[model samples]
Target: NVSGSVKLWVDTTQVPYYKKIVANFNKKYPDVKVKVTQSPNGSANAKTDVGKDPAKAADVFEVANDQLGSMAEAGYINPLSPDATKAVKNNNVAVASEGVTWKGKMFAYPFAEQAQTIYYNKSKLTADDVKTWDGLTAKGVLATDFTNAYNFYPVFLSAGTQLYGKTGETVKGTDVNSAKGEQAMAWFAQQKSNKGVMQTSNALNQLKSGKAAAILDGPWNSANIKKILGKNFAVAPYPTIKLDGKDVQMQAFLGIETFAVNSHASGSNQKAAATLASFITNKESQLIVYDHSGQIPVDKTAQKSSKVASDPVAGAVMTMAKPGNSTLMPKMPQMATFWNDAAPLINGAYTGSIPASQYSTKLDTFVKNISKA
Candidate 1:
């Protein structure tokens, strides 16, 4: 039997649900003690926060899959034992297992999947109209931020270029500096003339004001969008976009939310931390998290449950999480550089600041910068 004090960190808004999960955990492992605390800077910034002082950080903490590579390399988190790794691989969706596994070792317990879907005003655009980019725009305006790399970088994928290779781990495998990459860049430039598309920093506000019929967003804002649109709220997986004069599925980055055990935990408490991380991310706890936070569960059975299965937002996200609709966010350490440089390149293309003449040069520089050793 395990017996030790374990500290847990999660986003401030998720503290209550995590507390309940810890309570459930104690029921099964009574001798282990857990304290649920708000992560100082939130889970999105887990890498930096945990890095400030690994020993002082919580024994177990919430983190996004993109941060896994750097944390594992730095020895800030521990890889799951063989048995635990096998259980995660068997129990969760394929992408969830793949997202947390770096160098063939699973470093965290994945609990949720995140990918953006189109949330639209059903009253303004019918379900059929929202199925394709041309259809949606012809029917009504789509307000989205072109400045955000997370939202637009995947257009390159839609144009048929791989980022960091097909598996997303090869350091020198990014190849967006080609004709297909130019096609993706050209698509962004074309949107500048599309009267039906609105570039805005606040798509939600634009939606509320009736300035746009749809906004591309993730599940985190489902509740707020529902409140804003009321009965008109409708969500669907990304619509097909025209690339090279043919319809292709627009893609988004799929992120996995996971709980990791800190390697710096006291030796006696390491197993306790791992046990707690695994237990809290199990099917039951994943369902509870989804119910409380609207984060879509990654557990295979939990995702098939009535509540998630029947929920449109969850359904839309799950659809986007499929193979062709999304690219699993890579856990490469170079992702830090990728995020920093990708935004300006996309935004420049959209606004014509980079110009078509420079697409080749700009993409070459971007690939060079992000693929650095």
Candidate 2:
């Protein structure tokens, strides 16, 4: 008996997946039309774009959970209704749904669950090649964009550096400036001396040229790497790092795609939007998305589906991020301060542009001054 229409904005790349989901939704609520469109400004800016004109905003749109806090604070999206809350909690992996929640309210419908794995060329390195950070360093065969802190955070995370206090419930600020952080920074700084460690803008090309045996990257690059590397491409969880002579498994920043309902939608439109959001993220829809888009499913049951299990890249990536192996990337607005304050710190430290002694104090001060906005 749905009588209203709803609009949706999604990543252009996933247009086909949404089209299918929308088509299925129409079958159930034929009178309620669902219009699907790509955000011309890009998925990262969807929250802002919608906020620019709430009156004209799509009834529903997908966004990266990292931007959840700022978007919600800006009043760009509506909080989930009781029905929507049940759907998100029941269908998705706990951490993923948690990524979309803020101040005790669920903010969106979770779509993809994201995590990184070490993608390597089988002929260049074996599965055991990445068992430990030192093990890879010993082989003189590891390549990653160490210039970015996001890619480099696993080192400090493995060393027990808490960003915004563990589960993100408490904002304990940066934990990377402590003694453990200093040690972690030193380990990364030394990688520059490894002759095998070369920086190339194109990692896939590096793999093809046999210049790099392994690269630390996530699934966004996996499909392209697989197409080029063919059967030689192998996947493994991010390796452990030796911390005080003990092995600590490296943990990656988990990201998710989520559906945010527009706060400006009319009553009927809101109900239709919530219904469509739930349908778009349900088990069948998520598995269909996995089949078409190659994004990892967040639905626990959908993840167990045979279709997802048979795919080489998806299966391995899912295994690496499976429940306990993943951590949220912090959906707080204060995270913006982290990128601004920490990028130069990591860059200066890695390039020796800032001496270790100077950078240590700088890191400490940055942590102390940063606040939740």
Candidate 3:
């Protein structure tokens, strides 16, 4: 009814109201039937459920952004045109946009835009300006408004250290432990260094403080925002670059929830799938999504409409999301191994046990060696 898409195979985790959302879609497109084939509660279920039977697949499905490369590489997904992508831009984010892109082609409708942004307390007295890094250390400034271990990764991504180095298109995977990446890491470590920033083991505590001025977080954290900052909190894109010369928009990347047409379906079923996918992604379906899930909507028209403009959460999600050429966490099926290893490798640099220059060399050999499996 509401999502009007004939059938959507969704992960069901990020989607708060799968059944109701579908019912709503059916109502809108009275002629268009809607069905929901749900998978395990989380991301892992989404993958295993689909792999069991390729033919049993829903028209479109949602999966984690990092695993997108693995999925597409195995021929589990389809591609989209630039025109289709352009149409979805307003609600989708840049990083996930890239995740939806593979080998220079578009694949899925990027939903769940979760790029982290800088949040500040609008009530704080001095609105005078300071550069990103410089402002943090200056008098009356704290390193971060909300300091949580879970959210600190934004500091790493924004530091301008390419997540990956020159591979085919990029330099390859990155050495976040490198000098540049370290420089960024050190800035975040300073939150611990300066003792000025809130370093609570409890992330919620720092957020609850109304006087708290800034930190990096995503839309999911809104509950905390409501409980703590309430009307006092101010939202904006993350200040990726501090007093540092140049900066990149570093974001908290998440999965894209999308629908694809089942090629095996008959002519009518195929048409139904396409129409349903289009219907759910259409303007009206998005407004319902926007109202319920804090997750960013995938429809462009809904994003531009006045409804999204007024909401702080929706408005901020649009700002922090990056646009163009999404990269998987490294298309390697072994991505989990790589992401896990990065921390120890980077920590080696942090503690000075490893030299920055050797970061690339070490990463290359380390990832390659384990990849031999």
Candidate 4:
């Protein structure tokens, strides 16, 4: 009988899914206990590193794919065994697999490829009709938290911008204060002036209360929106915007959630942790995560399941994940600089507090600062 325990770090919100997996895992190894601990996204990189003693650190933890490189560089996680490499290749989506692989080594097993989509109340909005930002917001039916960087990212992305390219390997740069980006920001400013568009902080609450017809958000809000809208809830990838009379699809950045094993763990603890990670992301557990938590599963098997197709969030996820439809969210350490620098510039531009003519200079300064970071 195996007599070791493994601690799994996961978001408290998703503990229910792992709890069920733990119960199922116990059937095969009765003496091994899978303990659950609350750990939010990107929190485990240092806590479970090789320098940390195995007894004090989590055996398995959920890390954002973007942090995979840092974690691997720090020797925080174990490289996938040959069997895991084969299984990962066979079962997970290409982008998900790519997210956890660094320098030719698979350091984590991917489970969720998180991306944002537009959730609309079908009674008031039509998905196919939302071809341009001007057309969509002009109707006054769609609402989202415009101040949020993630929610407002589509505008910048539509202008052909990003913090990094090559999944954080190359600094692809941004258009935040560029000529095209300023033009995009000018349009946002115009929308901010429109009484129909939501500028107040109340927009998210309004959407949740069903006072607004549409909200551009991620799967985390799916169940709540569905509950409020009931049969009228419909979801689609972020809408396109007309840029100089050309239709450009809004690029939603892909963020993969991965299960990684701590390099410090040894013997049965390591074996059990690895086994649980694989089992928890297998087709069965992946479906469990989707059915219970509204998370879109990265398991190719679960992605093809008829049940996933039937779920609103999963359906939209599959649609957005299509080739050339989205960009991988930058994972590089330098990305933190972009968030802090771009927020003020974007918010100022959107509110008309910052002049569009000055954006080029402001954007250049921001990039210079990040290069130093």
Q: Model 3: how large is the Cα RMSD against the reference?
A: 5.3
Candidate with the larger lDDT of 1 and 3: 1
TM-score of 1: 0.98
Tens digits of per-residue lDDT for model 4, 112-185: 77788877777777766555556666664666555666666556667765555444466545435466666567
TM-score of each: 0.98, 0.93, 0.71, 0.86
Name the regions of candidate 2 deviating beyond 4 angstroms: 322-324
Error of 1 at 215 (Å): 0.3
lDDT of 2 by residue, 148-237 (tens): 768776567777777777766567666777888877767666767766566656666777777788877788888888876788888888
Clash pairs, candidate 4, are none
Worst 10 residues of 3 by lDDT: 140-149
Tens digits of lDDT, candidate 1, 1-373: 9889999999967999888888899998999999899899999999888999988999999999999999999989777889999999999999999999888899999999999999999999999999998889988999999889999999999999999999899998999999999999999998998898999999999999999999999998999999999999999999999998899999999999999998987889998988899899999999999888878999998988888989999999999999999999888888889989999999899899999999999999999999988
lDDT by residue for model 3 (112-204), tens? 555555565556523343224345334333434322323444455555444545331243455454555556545543344454355444445
Computed on alpha carbons, the lDDT of every model, listed in order, comes to: 0.92, 0.77, 0.54, 0.72
Error of 1 at 257 (Å): 0.5
Q: Let me know the TM-score candidate 4 reaches against the reference structure.
A: 0.86
Where model 3 places Cα greater than 4 Å from the true spot, the runs are 1-7, 11-32, 43-45, 52-59, 80-99, 120-134, 137-159, 165-179, 185-191, 198-201, 209-214, 240-256, 261-271, 323-334, 346-373
Q: How many clashing pairs per prediction, in order?
A: 0, 0, 30, 0
* Top-lDDT structure, candidate number: 1
